[PDB]
Amino acid sequence: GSHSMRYFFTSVSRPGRGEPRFIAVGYVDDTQFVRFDSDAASQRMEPRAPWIEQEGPEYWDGETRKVKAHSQTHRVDLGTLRGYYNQSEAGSHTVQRMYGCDVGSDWRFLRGYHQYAYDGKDYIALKEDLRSWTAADMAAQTTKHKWEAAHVAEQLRAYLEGTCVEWLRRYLENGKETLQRTDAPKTHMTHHAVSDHEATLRCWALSFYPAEITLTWQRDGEDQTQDTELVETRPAGDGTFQKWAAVVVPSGQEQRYTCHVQHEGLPKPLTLRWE
């Protein structure tokens, strides 16, 4: 099917407590494969998935060199942005940057992305054409004009359409057992009595990969959207994910309710009933 590679960078200033904290992580689909942390001891990009461990020292030295260079530019940016917004030297601020590429189910380039946030709000983003920018603020216009003048979009577009997807395809092949896999949800229901006239039915999906899943309840085949408690999909810690959906069922009505599970790992969508 379709795949993505994404890198996520966070820099946080720490006035009076030394250098800003800088953390970088990379993912292929929903699997993390590398990290860098400015505060940590190694000062190296580090593997976080088993398939990338075989890459070898030119890869690790080069990704270390590049990530340290990203760290420096984000350190400079914190200073620049405090100036653009006329903010005092005292407060902590946050810069975030995300970039990467998607390929379709033919493994060909589909979409590329590069966006930047300051203090949790959109700051500047590369448009879908990979040729122009969307600037949120008056302050971001300065950045937009500077990046237009230095032809930054052109350099990003070359990477997103070429290098990014080539390396995504490399990773998909080298990590085929981890990345071209699906783990189907293992499912069950629980039933707990709220009072003497109703009970909570909870539909569980566990140990699934990728994270994308649809869990719904129906009553007599009508969707119960407004009356379903649904939790955010959450990591198990072992590379798989979990979710549940619950409804409140009045007495004797359990047979009216069905839980429906849609997931790429399933041969057919599931319909589950308490019975």
């Binding site: 990379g26 260079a69 530019t73 942005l81 970039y99 990477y159």
Partner: peptide
């Protein structure tokens, strides 16, 4: 693989 070129806002 990371992008190799640098830019500043």
């Amino acid at each position: 693989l990371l992008y190799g070129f640098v830019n500043y806002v």
